[PDB]
RNA sequence: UAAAGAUGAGACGCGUUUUAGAGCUAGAAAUAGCAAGUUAAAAUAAGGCUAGUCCGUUAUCAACUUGAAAAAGUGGCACCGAGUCGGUGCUU
DNA sequence: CGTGATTCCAGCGTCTCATCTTTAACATAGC
DNA sequence: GCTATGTATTGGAATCACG
């Protein structure tokens, strides 16, 4: 057997895989072809890629699910309201509800009168004349005292309930308090009365304009403060203003309180905070705060409500009616003015729904902003239009009642209006008086966020716990739903379990046991050194307890100085003690212990072990719940131990956070032999003082064995990872591909598996930085030389501006016209730390001025330019790291340790997702753990970063073009494999740095090299950074092993051949499409069969419906249809589109479903399921992917020669002046070959694309633009590559000529082609001849 | 310490559809002129049964055999070349 | 009267709460 | 070496020449 290696390149939409044997050669194997075709064996290379649509997050699905729940709950609310009115409405109008329900149906299908409200034309007309809108009805019901018809009352209540506004404000809003300035004046007067020593000059300041401005709270606060020179934003009055605005002012400083007096009116805990303030400073401020609350209410009412408050107690309805009347007046005036001045546009405005005029604004589809945009020039053109212009500038012209900005309306307004209506009308209807509370509750009822859906054990999102088996109506919500259990579950279901005990549940972060464990763990490794002690010794259990009692149980923080003084000097009488393992202060502290001591004021209660659980039950209670009512209810069980003041303090106290170790891992499990737990061992470990890591990793203790036993699905193991769903899908596909490849090679696991993951996915900032630096320095470079943001994208110009137009190495300036001859050099050479960022770059006239380029710039340059670099640093032109790198010469230069660190940086992978992937592959591939409890590393999972491979490609001219074809994924995978294998062969000792598993200074000059480069040995010629070009040995081999790792005379040629291989296994992952049934937009009624009904009885021919259904998978059916008038059973073979809506119906019984669509005598066994991207080979190598039931996609790749790819990369500058000149010469030489690329494209188009018109247009445009510069033509050809790229057709633009996408909207040809079932890797293929069917 | 993404829950405002919002005048009528325009009901993935204030757009999936289904199993090697893979040699 | 070419188009915008992760900053232990 | 501890794209539908 030939031992091989697998390289993989993971990405969002692609997974590249490659198999390499020795000499970095891709094997070519013959694979059997199943099916009924004639082929029996096909040659396939062992490199390819898998293509799939990127994974989608569940965010859209979560939004849709929440929307469905909201709609169901709204409908249930309406049903409850109707049930309240059942008997009375039935007595009044028997079929009023029935008419309301069938209002959507056409008159032909209505079972009652077409007029819903009254059931007759006359009364409906009279009502609509009396009340133009529902708001008029609401205002009338609120104000008028005469008895009204029950139907109007029901309509008003239904309109209030169905649309109730947000709940972002809790408590009572008091809409009558709408005095924007009068309340402000009263607040100022009260403050002055309380603070007569410090009056506030409120004269000359408009409270209304400043506070009701359509601006941010901070901006309006600053504007208010600016008119008060004697008051600041952080002052007591300023903090009151901030509280009124809804901010979070800090009253601790103003009232000199120790407690952080953070109060916000929006929070429901505001009242409790006010009570807390009613116990420290006094009650004299309480009315003051009340006034601020009223002021805040006015501010909230300022923007939403614009109407007088004395006229009525329904300000919302009054404001809506005022807006409606303004709309009527403005419409009348606009019509008059248009008729008077511009009669020709009148029909355009008031009759053209298709335009953005008034007709389209009302009857058609047009937003308010669109209408304003369309009408503003018209208004400007006319004369006598001033009020309309003023309103348009105010966005208050011809406004509707139902606008997009109605979401600011609090539910308190609607609740107050409903309460007023019920009070007015209860004297005429007894049931309204009897059920007023029920209706108010229905309006105000919300399901708490911690309760979740009110399911009964049939949802994967539910966690509610019930108290009785009944229906959870909003009136008995507390009696049924167990608030405590449900709230506890809501938090517990989302917390992580213990890593060592996956079944157990983690402890809260502030648990007393947790803090004790941390403190003891930190104290175990504490040593103390005195004069009389020969050797430092660990602290005994008694000593640890004494120290904890003296320091940890007496001070919030314990310092090293406190430990040395308060214990050794005080108790042990030690005048000189040195502590090891701790610096500065101790991180561990008994914060919860001291907090509880402060609150309950009973140290002995805390010190009692019997209270431990109780104490825990307190701390957990302070973490699970955020609602203070829940906290109080939970703590009521233990309210007997502590006074009511202590209970109130506990309710006020609330901290959050969770630890990472469960209680059983601390005090649950006990060692079998010793009878001690983890905590017991920590409190007394003899003299070794083994800590937690030592306790759980001790092979002489049962703890490790218990952890291993307790610690005992690939899809589930991947779904629990941390990352985007697309990357997770890529990882799963990569694992499946690896399994398939291992099965391919005769079930021989490879020696190495290299993994590289591509990636997860500024001019203004540079301008700002340059301006800040120039203003700090005060130079004149910017003033004399203007620079655009786009021009700053060039590295040379940005570096020139950063260096104040001066050389960074020599005390001299630079010229813009000389930038072409200037050089860019790295402070740390690329052969030590590969950095391409600004922090490690320098613009200099010549590199020879830097001194010894092999090392850090010479100390002479540092002595020359230290002051200049410091001045640049002070202006933020350069960073501290860059300054240190420039001044590293005086700090010992580039030491060997620095080179080792740079090698580590170049080798390690920062991202943890790659680590998780490597761990998963190591676990799956390796299952041989020896008797010594160590896994035998038969398979070496290696990890690599894209930068190294990209540098390799860009250094050895192995260029890539992303748009040419999809072979670049497979080529990247192959290069990853090659580089990983070569690196692990040449530097095996570096495995630990970049190979997952468990297995430095000696490396730098068994010394590997003196430089920090690790990929440099591939270079045939190496530059000594001083122009001393030398050569490495032709055959690179590891010195110790002697095994050849690089054959420059063969490896380069082999790589060139591999990248030039025409056949590459490019496979599109066939996947059944899923999601929404069709486009969610509702179409108006049309006489077309493409419409989809929105309901079972709603014929699309009348009510419209959806269109554009999404096809999950097509089905190739061979059957017969009633062809012609004679109903001749002609055999038919055609693709039928199975929509997502019909998927369940078809899968339940295919025969009946296919018969229902007109197909007869269906062959059950001949049914062939074709998901999206199913592959067809028609003839002459033309392959097509079945995008849908009626559309095809290009499926062939263009195997462009490597020379053309290199020329395209160089000419277009897709990403050493002599090298650049030689590259330009090659670009000119292959420009002679430019027409060959177009010829190849045309040949491929004729062979496989069959797009005659587009090809002719491309040729004509190319012939026209032959005179264009070479680089522009190269870029345009790169764009032209979109014509032949695999996947869906897409339009492109060759210079100024736009070529549209050619669509293959006929699937008749594939019916006689060869269907291909490609495996996950595509090596195992199943060709089926469809022409043999039927 | 600060910042981002993933997941879940509770809520809003719209938006979009059919109907109700008697259009009038004259003109055979088609068609011209004039009036009016803001709102409301219902639905907001068909729907399903486990009938709940439940669930219905995530994730997963080449073909064949077995396995409910999760899952398992089903396919020679070496060499010479290379237009999407061919040809040669040993066993079959 | 089928058929290739050409055109337009797709629901959206907030708010609150909780839990995880991850990235950018460090010290302390271990196996 | 590694684990813990704390600080747009594109398929559908329509429409349009159009032989």
UniProtKB/Swiss-Prot annotation:
Residues 1-61 are annotated as: RuvC-I. Changing residue 972 to A: Only cleaves 1 DNA strand, probably the noncomplementary strand. Processes guide RNAs correctly. In vivo, loss of Cas9-mediated CRISPR interference in plasmid transformation. Mn(2+) 1 binds at residues 9, 756, 760. The keyword Zinc does not apply. Endonuclease activity on target dsDNA requires Mg(2+). The RuvC-like nuclease domain should have 2 divalent cations, while the HNH domain should have 1. Crystals are often soaked in MgCl(2) or MnCl(2+). Keywords: Antiviral defense, DNA-binding, Endonuclease, Exonuclease, Hydrolase, Magnesium, Manganese, Metal-binding, Nuclease, RNA-binding. Its cofactor is Mg(2+). Residues 55-712 are annotated as: Recognition lobe. Changing residue 968 to A: Decreased DNA cleavage. In vivo, loss of Cas9-mediated CRISPR interference in plasmid transformation. It holds the Pfam family Cas9_REC. CRISPR (clustered regularly interspaced short palindromic repeat) is an adaptive immune system that provides protection against mobile genetic elements (viruses, transposable elements and conjugative plasmids). CRISPR clusters contain spacers, sequences complementary to antecedent mobile elements, and target invading nucleic acids. CRISPR clusters are transcribed and processed into CRISPR RNA (crRNA). In type II CRISPR systems correct processing of pre-crRNA requires a trans-encoded small RNA (tracrRNA), endogenous ribonuclease 3 (rnc) and this protein. This is CRISPR-associated endonuclease Cas9/Csn1.
């Amino acid at each position: 057997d030939k031992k091989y290696s697998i390289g993989l390149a993971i990405g969002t939409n692609s997974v590249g895989w490659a198999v390499i044997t020795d000499e970095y050669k891709v094997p070519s194997k013959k694979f059997k072809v199943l099916g009924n075709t004639d082929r029996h064996s096909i040659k396939k290379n062992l490199i390819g890629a898998l293509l799939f649509d990127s994974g989608e997050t569940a965010e859209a699905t979560r939004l849709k699910r929440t929307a469905r729940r909201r709609y169901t709950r709204r409908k249930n609310r309406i049903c409850y309201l109707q049930e309240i009115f059942s008997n009375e409405m039935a007595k009044v109008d028997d079929s009023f509800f029935h008419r309301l329900e069938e209002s959507f149906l056409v008159e032909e299908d209505k079972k009652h009168e077409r007029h819903p409200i009254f059931g007759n034309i006359v009364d409906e007309v009279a009502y609509h004349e009396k009340y133009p809108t529902i708001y008029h009805l609401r205002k009338k019901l609120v104000d008028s005292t005469d008895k009204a018809d029950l139907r109007l009352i029901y309509l008003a209540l239904a309109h209030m309930i169905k649309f109730r506004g947000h709940f972002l404000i809790e408590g009572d809003l008091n809409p009558d308090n709408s005095d924007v300035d009068k309340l402000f004046i009263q607040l100022v007067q009260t403050y002055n009365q309380l603070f007569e020593e410090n009056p506030i000059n409120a004269s000359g300041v408009d409270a209304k304009a400043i506070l009701s401005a359509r601006l941010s709270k901070s901006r309006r606060l600053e504007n208010l403060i600016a008119q008060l020179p004697g008051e600041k934003k952080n002052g007591l009055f300023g903090n009151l203003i901030a509280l009124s605005l809804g901010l979070t002012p800090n009253f601790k400083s103003n009232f000199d309180l120790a407690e952080d007096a953070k109060l916000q009116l929006s929070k429901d805990t505001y009242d409790d905070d006010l009570d807390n303030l009613l116990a420290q400073i006094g009650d004299q401020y309480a009315d003051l705060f009340l006034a601020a609350k009223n002021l805040s209410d006015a501010i909230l009412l300022s923007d939403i409500l614009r109407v007088n408050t004395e006229i009525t107690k329904a300000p919302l309805s009054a404001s809506m009616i005022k807006r409606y009347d303004e709309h009527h007046q403005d419409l009348t005036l606009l019509k008059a003015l248009v008729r008077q001045q511009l009669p020709e546009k009148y029909k355009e405005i008031f009759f053209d729904q298709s335009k953005n005029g008034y007709a389209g604004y009302i009857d058609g589809g047009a937003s308010q902003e669109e209408f304003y945009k369309f009408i503003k020039p018209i208004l400007e053109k006319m004369d006598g239009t001033e009020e309309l212009l003023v309103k348009l500038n105010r966005e208050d012209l011809l406004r509707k009642q139902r606008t997009f900005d109605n979401g600011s309306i609090p539910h308190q307004i609607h609740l107050g209006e409903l309460h007023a209506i019920l009070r007015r009308q209860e004297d005429f209807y007894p049931f309204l008086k009897d059920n007023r509370e029920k209706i108010e509750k229905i309006l105000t009822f919300r399901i708490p966020y911690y309760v979740g859906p009110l399911a009964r054990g049939n949802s994967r999102f539910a966690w509610m716990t019930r108290k009785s088996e009944e229906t959870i109506t909003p009136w008995n919500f507390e009696e049924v739903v167990d608030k405590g259990a449900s709230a506890q579950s809501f938090i517990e279901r989302m917390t992580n379990f213990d890593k060592n005990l996956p079944n157990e549940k983690v402890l809260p972060k502030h648990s007393l046991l947790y803090e004790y464990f941390t403190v003891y763990n930190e104290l175990t490794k504490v040593k103390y050194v005195t004069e009389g002690m020969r050797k430092p010794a660990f602290l005994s259990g008694e000593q640890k307890k004494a120290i904890v009692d003296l320091l940890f149980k007496t001070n919030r923080k314990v310092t090293v100085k406190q430990l040395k003084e308060d214990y050794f000097k005080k108790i042990e009488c030690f005048d000189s003690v040195e502590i090891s393992g701790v610096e500065d202060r101790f991180n561990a502290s008994l914060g919860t212990y001291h907090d509880l001591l402060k609150i309950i004021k009973d140290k002995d209660f805390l010190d009692n072990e019997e209270n431990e659980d109780i104490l825990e039950d307190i701390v957990l209670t302070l973490t699970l719940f955020e609602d203070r009512e829940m906290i109080e209810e939970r703590l009521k069980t233990y309210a007997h131990l502590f006074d009511d003041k202590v209970m109130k303090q506990l309710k006020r106290r609330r901290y959050t956070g969770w630890g990472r170790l469960s209680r059983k891992l601390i005090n649950g499990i006990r060692d079998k032999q010793s009878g001690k737990t983890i905590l017991d061992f920590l409190k007394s470990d003899g003299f070794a003082n083994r800590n937690f890591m030592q306790l759980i990793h001790d092979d002489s203790l049962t703890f490790k064995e218990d952890i291993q036993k307790a610690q005992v699905s690939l899809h589930e193991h991947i779904a629990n990872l941390a990352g985007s769903p697309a990357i997770k899908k890529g990882i799963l596909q990569t694992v499946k591909v690896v399994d398939e490849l291992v099965k391919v090679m005769g079930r021989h696991k490879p020696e190495n598996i290299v993994i590289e993951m591509a990636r997860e996915n500024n001019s203004r900032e540079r301008m700002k930085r340059i301006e800040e630096g120039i203003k700090e320095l005060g130079s004149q470079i910017l003033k004399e030389h203007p620079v655009e943001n786009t021009q700053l994208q060039n590295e040379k110009l940005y570096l020139y501006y950063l260096q104040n137009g001066r050389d960074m190495y020599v005390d001299q300036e630079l010229d813009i016209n000389r930038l072409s001859d200037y050089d860019v050099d790295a402070i740390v050479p690329q052969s030590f730390l590969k950095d391409d960022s600004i922090d490690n770059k320098v613009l200099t006239r010549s590199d020879k001025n830097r001194g010894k380029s092999d090392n850090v710039p010479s100390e002479e340059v540092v002595k020359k330019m230290k002051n200049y670099w410091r001045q640049l640093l002070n202006a933020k032109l350069i960073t501290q790291r860059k300054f240190d790198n420039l001044t590293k010469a005086e700090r010992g230069g580039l030491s060997e340790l620095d080179k080792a660190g740079f090698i580590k940086r170049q080798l390690v992978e920062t991202r943890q997702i790659t680590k998780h992937v490597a761990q998963i592959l190591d676990s799956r591939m390796n299952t041989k753990y020896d008797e010594n409890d160590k896994l035998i590393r038969e398979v070496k999972v290696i990890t690599l970063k894209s930068k190294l491979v990209s540098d390799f490609r860009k250094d050895f001219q192995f260029y890539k073009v992303r748009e040419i074809n999809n072979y670049h994924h497979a080529h990247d995978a192959y290069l990853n494999a090659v580089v990983g294998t070569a690196l692990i062969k040449k530097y095996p000792k570096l495995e630990s740095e970049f190979v997952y598993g468990d297995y430095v200074r000696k490396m730098i000059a068994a010394k590997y090299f003196f430089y920090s480069n690790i990929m440099n040995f591939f270079k045939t010629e190496i530059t000594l950074a001083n122009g001393e070009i030398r050569k490495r040995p032709l055959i690179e081999t590891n010195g110790e092993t002697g095994e050849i790792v690089w054959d420059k005379g063969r490896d380069f040629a082999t790589v060139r051949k591999v990248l030039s291989m025409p056949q590459v296994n490019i496979v599109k992952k066939t996947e059944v499409q899923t999601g929404g049934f069709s486009k969610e937009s509702i179409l108006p009624k049309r006489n077309s069969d493409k419409l989809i009904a929105r309901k079972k009885d709603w014929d699309p021919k009348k009510y419209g419906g959806f269109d554009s259904p999404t096809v999950a998978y097509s089905v190739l059916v061979v059957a017969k249809v009633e062809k012609g008038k004679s109903k001749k059973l002609k055999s038919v073979k055609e693709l039928l589109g199975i929509t997502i809506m019909e998927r369940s119906s078809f899968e339940k019984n295919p025969i009946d479903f296919l018969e229902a669509k007109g197909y007869k005598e269906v062959k059950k066994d001949l049914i062939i399921k074709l998901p999206k991207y199913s592959l067809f080979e028609l003839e002459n190598g033309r392959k097509r992917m079945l995008a849908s039931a009626g559309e095809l996609q290009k499926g062939n790749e263009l195997a462009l020669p490597s020379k053309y790819v290199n020329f395209l990369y160089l000419a277009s500058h897709y990403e050493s002046p002599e090298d650049n000149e030689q590259k330009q010469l090659f670009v000119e030489q292959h420009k002679h070959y430019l027409d060959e690329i177009i010829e190849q494209i045309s040949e491929f188009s004729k062979r496989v694309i069959l797009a005659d018109a587009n090809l002719d247009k491309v040729l004509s445009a190319y012939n026209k633009h032959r005179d264009k510069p070479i680089r522009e033509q190269a870029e345009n050809i790169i764009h032209l590559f979109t014509l032949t790229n695999l996947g869906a057709p897409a339009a492109f633009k060759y210079f100024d000529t736009t070529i549209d996408r050619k669509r293959y909207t006929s699937t008749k040809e594939v019916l006689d082609a060869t269907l291909i079932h490609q495996s996950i890797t595509g090596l195992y293929e199943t060709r089926i001849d469809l022409s043999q069917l039927g």
